[PDB]
Amino acid sequence: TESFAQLFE
Amino acid sequence: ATVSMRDMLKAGVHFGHQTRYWNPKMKPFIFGARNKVHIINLEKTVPMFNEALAELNKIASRKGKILFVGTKRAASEAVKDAALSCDQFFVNHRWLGGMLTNWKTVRQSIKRLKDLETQSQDGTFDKLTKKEALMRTRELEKLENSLGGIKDMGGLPDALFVIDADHEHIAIKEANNLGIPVFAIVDTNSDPDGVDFVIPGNDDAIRAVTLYLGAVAATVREGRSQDLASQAE
Amino acid sequence: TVSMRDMLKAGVHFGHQTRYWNPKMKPFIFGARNKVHIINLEKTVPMFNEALAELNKIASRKGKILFVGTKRAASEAVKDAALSCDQFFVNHRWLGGMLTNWKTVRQSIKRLKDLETQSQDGTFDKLTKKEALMRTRELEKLENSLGGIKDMGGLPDALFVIDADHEHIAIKEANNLGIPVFAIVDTNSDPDGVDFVIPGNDDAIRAVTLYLGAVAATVREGRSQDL
Ligand SMILES: [Zn+2]
Known part of the structure; x- marks a missing residue:
């Protein structure tokens, strides 16, 4: 799954 | 009962208070802090939530009574439907103050309540007065x-x-005084020490709240499936 | 015409302990689960569909269907359904000899209809003397x-x-006379003489109404297509 940081960005 | 780590992301579980x-x-x-808010760690969140789901599922299998608590007006409506559903x-x-403990005293209250309901299709027609009728209703x-929504229970x-x-x-304090296990959707401003299954979500937007309600609702249906029959056709 | 989603809701799949x-x-x-047998709905529909076809076939020649539902629960339900069709x-x-012993029951129906009118008209009243109570x-x-059968319906x-x-008792007399029979057989009932069979829960109020609905539907449809 995609990293939380990138998703929130 | 493994809600995608991405569904909640759009729901709003990430946005806490300031x-x-x-x-x-x-x-x-x-x-971290988006606009000085406090963004809950979803990766930390998700195992706990799914774990509690399983915990609550084995409960419903042993046929242990579950309960939910009303909050904001929107939350209350949502809670009702999910409960009635199953x-x-x-x-x-x-929460009627000290419901637990004063559960024997509120039991008498439930008794009187049901009698009135029964006598609401009886006492209303006969001896009706322009005064007593309004009292009853x-x-x-x-x-x-x-x-x-609690009258049914007939027990602890x-x-x-x-x-x-x-x-x-108030509700958690009484529950800790009896051993009755609990689950709470703790937020960035909630003392979770008393909880036995910390669900670090966000009681807000309702949307996300509806997710948690829907989730547990599903797990207790699995308990009923163990209490009824297995999936087949 | 019924669907799997239809039955799955009603609970037709539920079978006796x-x-x-x-x-x-x-x-x-x-597969039985939780000390209860679970009907294989996957088989139910294919046979139920065939049976609905057969019921449509019958009503084409304006045949007379008879519905039997002694069970107190479904008893009133069967009454309502038989009216629409x-x-x-x-x-x-199911009074013994209902079919086999037709002569006797036919005389009985004659007596009934005669008694019916007399009292309906009012003759009974004038008589009184507790004899009116007896005849009512x-x-x-x-x-x-x-x-339910007063209007002829012989064989x-x-x-x-x-x-x-x-x-x-009913599923037998019919076999003796060669009249085809249908049944919502559950898991505790003998699959004998039923001819066209239909595995279905026969206890739940929900499921019985489902069956009644579909069967009543096809029967009136057949009458209309011949009409
Ligand atoms: Zn909040």
Whole structure:
């Protein structure tokens, strides 16, 4: 799954 | 019962309150500060939620009574439907102070309540007075508001699933005094020490709240499936 | 015409407790769970669909269907359904000899109709002297079962039974005379003489209404297509 940081960005 | 780590992301579970109102104990579930808010760590969140789901599922299998607590007006409506859908009763808005412990005294209250309901299709037609009629209706309404949704129980519930927890700190205290396990959707300003299954979500937007309600609702249906029959056709 | 989603809601798949079960019904059963047999719905529909076709076929030649539902629960339900399709019904004990012994029961119906009018008109009243009470009460008893077939119906061309055990007496007389029969057989009922069979829960109020709905539907449809 995609990293939380990138998703929130 | 493994809600995608991305569905909640759009729901709004990530957005907490601001620092000015932030329980310092919640540090283990923090990711930073968007516009000085406090973004819950979803990766930290998700195992706990799914774990509680399984816990609550084995409960419903042993046929242990579950319970939910009303919060904001929107939350209360949502809680009601999910509960009625399956079972597990439900509170509404006030929690009727010391319901647990004064459960024997509120039991007499439930008794009187049901009698009035029964006598609401009896005593109403005969001996009706322009005074007594209003008395009966009004009292029933108040009693129903909160006591309704619990009257069915006829006994001590074996679990509780509140929301936010902070708004109902009173409920957790009584539950800790009896051993009755609980689950709470703790937020960035809620003391979770008393909880036995910390669900670090966000009691807000309702949207996300509806997710948690839907989730547990599904797990207790699996308990009923063990109480009825297995999936087949 | 019924769908799997239809039955799955009603609970047709629910079957009697493990202990009570005729091993002859094992094919129509899927996998028992929680000491309860779970019907294999996947098989139910294909046969139920064939049976609805057959019921449509019958009503084409304006045959007379008879519905049998002694079970107190479904008894009233069967009454209502048989009205919409105007087919005969029997929601009480299937009086022995109902078909086989036709001469006797036919005379009985004659007596009934005669008693019916007399009292309806009012003759009974004038008589009074407790004899009027007797003739009204006799009507009640007769109507409690005889009612539903009063309008002739001699030797129907099919019988629809809710249960395939409780009404074993009916599922027999018909076999003797060669009248085809249908039944919502459960897991505790013998799959014998039923001819066109239909594995289905025969207890739940929900499921019985489902069956009644679909069967009544096809029967009136057949009447209309011939019309
Ligand atoms: Zn909040």
